[PDB]
Amino acid sequence: ASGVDDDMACHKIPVEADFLYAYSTAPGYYSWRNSKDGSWFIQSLCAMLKQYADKLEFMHILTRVNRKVATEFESFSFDATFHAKKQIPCIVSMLTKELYFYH
Amino acid sequence: ASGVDDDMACHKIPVEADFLYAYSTAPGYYSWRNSKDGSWFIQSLCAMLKQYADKLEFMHILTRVNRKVATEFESFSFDATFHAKKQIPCIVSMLTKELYFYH
Amino acid sequence: SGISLDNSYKMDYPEMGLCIIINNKNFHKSTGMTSRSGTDVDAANLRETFRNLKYEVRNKNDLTREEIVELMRDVSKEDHSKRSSFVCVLLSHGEEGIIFGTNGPVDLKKITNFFRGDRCRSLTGKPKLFIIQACRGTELDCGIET
Amino acid sequence: SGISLDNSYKMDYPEMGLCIIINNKNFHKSTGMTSRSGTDVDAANLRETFRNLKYEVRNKNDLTREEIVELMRDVSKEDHSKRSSFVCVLLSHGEEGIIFGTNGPVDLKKITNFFRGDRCRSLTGKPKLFIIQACRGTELDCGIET
Amino acid sequence: DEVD
Amino acid sequence: DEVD
């Protein structure tokens, strides 16, 4: 087959390619931080990297972070409006290959 | 250790958890479609699912889709403004586990 | 039994789940939206692709904003207890956070809210996948030689 | 040689790359932004975590919007030829698409644009990771019992 | 090519 | 707990 938008003579990639945004929370949502232990997201991200960086591909590590934050944390507040709330991190990948911190 | 925001007696998960948004393009960008062959994104997504759904975890399949769209496609337009443009799909994951279409 | 890790979603339910494809090709003249030539190729490719993955594929063509909302609401109200996941594919015109019905825009959030963990209990804990082929703005990527 | 697949990024360059941590804890009174108690714990945890992954960690505390932009520009202008990747961690107040400097907001797009494939050639084709701990709005997730 |  |  042949077309007007494929197999260019000069190879190019999108200027937005190869970016990965690891957001602590879903679009439009607040993000939680424990004034003593640190943010739920960073706490979890570091714990998962420490345990899996030499074993799993980055997206899989971030997925474990999503599960950890989603299941293990719930806000406590004297203000009913902000009490018993949850959080889910948001992985935004424009990566074009798998990423392993080891080789 | 102990705190006010962990190990709740009643287990809960975020209402936004377990969602995966496979966007055809990066935030704020146009998305390209070939009037004859279909959109670059769907064309690629189907090709990668057909070839890897029984071999790779979903995020890894979508990463191959990102690479395929990013490298193999470039717009052709008689209008200089829309000519020779590129596209990078955008994987947005709020999933909490790995996803395999097979078992 | 032996050690259990639960690192992957349970995908061995009796059914893989639904794959709802909303294929908007023709738009009401009143909207000023152009016809999306080639989208039928996408729709057909998706139906075959997900059919082979054992999903219950349901296609809908040229739906108004109201029909899109009604479809999503109805689908979210079904009993997905025996289904492993849910897939929705949206093919249409769009802008950031918006997908177009044949007669006007629909907030993507309104569509996905029907499937929130607290609003569709039979899908709680199960993967909900939304595949979106539509614009998210008007920026163009000039690319870079590699 | 044998079959080559190139499915994973080349991460065996002489250096893993930089890990820039912007830790904004104290904000100018004029902004009305509260102090972010606990962020130092995050900053320290990140420094240790990425140190063990062999990244060149550089920390910056309480940067104004202008300093954040200057830092990013300067960093993007370095020669990353011998570095496998780039990591930037942002710890601060924020809203959708925005991160706060100690004296005002900064569009995330302005920060990331410096690293576009066409503007930072020594990082073209290499993974650029932005880790963001900041709000993206004011919605709260009520959660659902499982 | 056309845009969505 | 506080929000960012």
Q: Which residues pair with C99 in a beta bridge?
A: C94, C106
Angle at the Cα of A18 (from C136 to A15), degrees rounded to 5? Answer: 60
Nearest-angstrom CA–CA distance, A8 and A5: 8
A31 has a chain F CB within 8 A of its CB: yes
DSSP for residue C30:
G
- What is the span of the domain harbouring residue B77? 1-103
A103 has a chain C CB within 8 A of its CB: no
Chain B with chain C: Cβ pairs closer than 8 A: 153
Find the residue in E nearest to C98 (Cα).
E4
Experimental method: X-ray
Among B41, B38, B35, B40, residue whose Cα is nearest residue B21: B41
Q: For residue D135, indicate whether it is catalytic.
A: yes
Closest Cα in chain D, distance from residue C136 (Å):
15
Find the residue in B nearest to C136 (Cα).
B28
For residue C5 the two structure tokens come to 């890790």
Are residues B6 and A74, on separate chains, in Cβ contact within 8 Å? Answer: yes
What are the CA-CA distances from residue C13 to residues A79, C2, C10, C16, C82 (Å)? 41, 21, 7, 7, 6
D93 has a chain F CB within 8 A of its CB: yes
**Burial call D58-77: b when 16+ CB within 10 Å, e when fewer:** eeeebbbbebbbebbeebbe
Nearest-angstrom CA–CA distance, D25 and C72: 43
Are residues C141 and A15, on separate chains, in Cβ contact within 8 Å? Answer: yes
Which CATH number covers residue A57? Answer: 3.30.70.1470
B97 has a chain D CB within 8 A of its CB: no
Q: For residue C80, indicate whether it is catalytic.
A: no
Residues of D at the C interface, defined by Cβ within 8 angstroms: 116-118, 121, 124-125, 142-144, 146
Nearest-angstrom CA–CA distance, C4 and C2: 6
Nearest-angstrom CA–CA distance, B16 and A86: 9
| Structural domains in chain D plus CATH codes | 1-146 (3.40.50.1460)
Are residues B12 and D141, on separate chains, in Cβ contact within 8 Å? Answer: no
- Report the number of distinct structural domains present in chain A: 1
Question: Which amino acid makes up residue C67?
Answer: E
